[model samples]
Target chain A: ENKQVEEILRLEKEIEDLQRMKEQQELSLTEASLQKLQERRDQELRRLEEE
Target chain B: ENKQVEEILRLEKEIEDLQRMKEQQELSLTEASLQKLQERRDQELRRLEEE
Candidate 1:
């Protein structure tokens, strides 16, 4: 009864955790300094995200 | 004469730059605190790298 439903629920929670983590990282990067290095990182992130 | 060769040279340098940046970010995480969050980020990096 709970086996299949349990797996889906676990996976859905995992996805939610990952999304929160992504936003947290973006915010951390946003608040930090080092624009030159950060700019390069953001470009790389966008490049990865695109593909 | 230099068209294809020049493109390869540029691409090779870009790869080298990316490797250097990867190492730099790893070192940054290594030196910083917040092991829990950094550990999570490292996992994500490895996951992305694996795929």
Candidate 2:
């Protein structure tokens, strides 16, 4: 039954958009954390050189 | 139509449950991997100190 078809379409679109946003946010967070680890490693190497 | 309302409700509940479980599993996996990396880094530091 296509009753309330417009509402169904709207809800479906919103869900899809939210799902995409969630995926992008997760990826960005992961990359940012990895970058932090790399920066920490660089600082550790610098300290070792100074010692 | 109200004819399939019960089935729709059941499906929606199941989807919600699955989504929650997926989130929990993803969080657990991410944390576990991070812990593993942390342990490895600690071991490397200990080895460097021994050298």
Candidate 3:
């Protein structure tokens, strides 16, 4: 097994899991919630990556 | 630039950012916070990776 490939897969999994968690909580989270703060920050980061 | 290398670096940066966010919130986050739950889950995943 290639170590680099394994780590890439691992990171993708983690990112997916994190994004999933953000999606689930977004329904109830308010603007002031610290969790929401992190979520919003992360969303921006990912958005910036596309361009 | 190699796509694989850039992706690896990107993933590493995201993981670091996520972990840094988790560490900063550790002092104030409680058991039931959904963010805390995600954080806890992520901590376990990383721990499991080492072994």
Candidate 4:
């Protein structure tokens, strides 16, 4: 039970840590930037398909 | 048209930037860490049920 408690607390902390890291990874795609990235991604596909 | 091209090129570089950052982010959790995490998570849940 003590071991269980120890590990449970540690893991909850680890989960919280991972969530923070993942949250930091979030980047808001803006109207201009989003449009530009999406357009470039589309063009990249087109180039691989043809020119 | 030149402005559009410039914006597209710049965004392509930024998109590449995110892609690389994402690749680094992926280095954090692996099967080794994942299994340990899952074990901890599962045990953590069971602890809740028991006490």
- Share of real contacts kept by model 2? 0.00
Model 1 residue B46 CA deviation in Å: 17
Report the C-alpha lDDT of model 3 over B1-51, residue by residue, as the tens digit: 232332333454665687555544443343234443455446665564464
Winner by DockQ: 4
Please give the ranking of all candidate structures by lDDT, highest first, separated by commas: 3, 4, 2, 1
Higher-DockQ candidate among 1 and 4? 4
User: Candidate 3, residues A1-51: lDDT per residue as tens digits?
Assistant: 234333433554676676555544543344335454456457778634456
| C-alpha TM-score for every candidate | 0.30, 0.29, 0.29, 0.29
Model 3, position A35, has a per-residue lDDT of 51
Task: Indicate the worst ten consecutive residues by lDDT in candidate 1 chain B.
Answer: B1-10
State the weakest 10-residue window (summed lDDT) of model 3 chain A.
A1-10
* Candidates 1 and 4, the one with greater lDDT: 4
- Residue A14, candidate 3: how far off, in angstroms? 1.0
Q: DockQ rank, highest first? A: 4, 3, 1, 2
User: Where does the lowest 10-residue lDDT sum fall in candidate 4 chain B?
Assistant: B22-31
lDDT at position B14, candidate 1: 56
Measured over the true interface residues after superposition, the C-alpha RMSD of each candidate is 17.0, 20.3, 16.9, 10.7
Clashes of each: 0, 0, 0, 0
Q: Give the TM-score of candidate 2.
A: 0.29
Specify the poorest-scoring 10-residue window by lDDT in model 3 chain B: B1-10
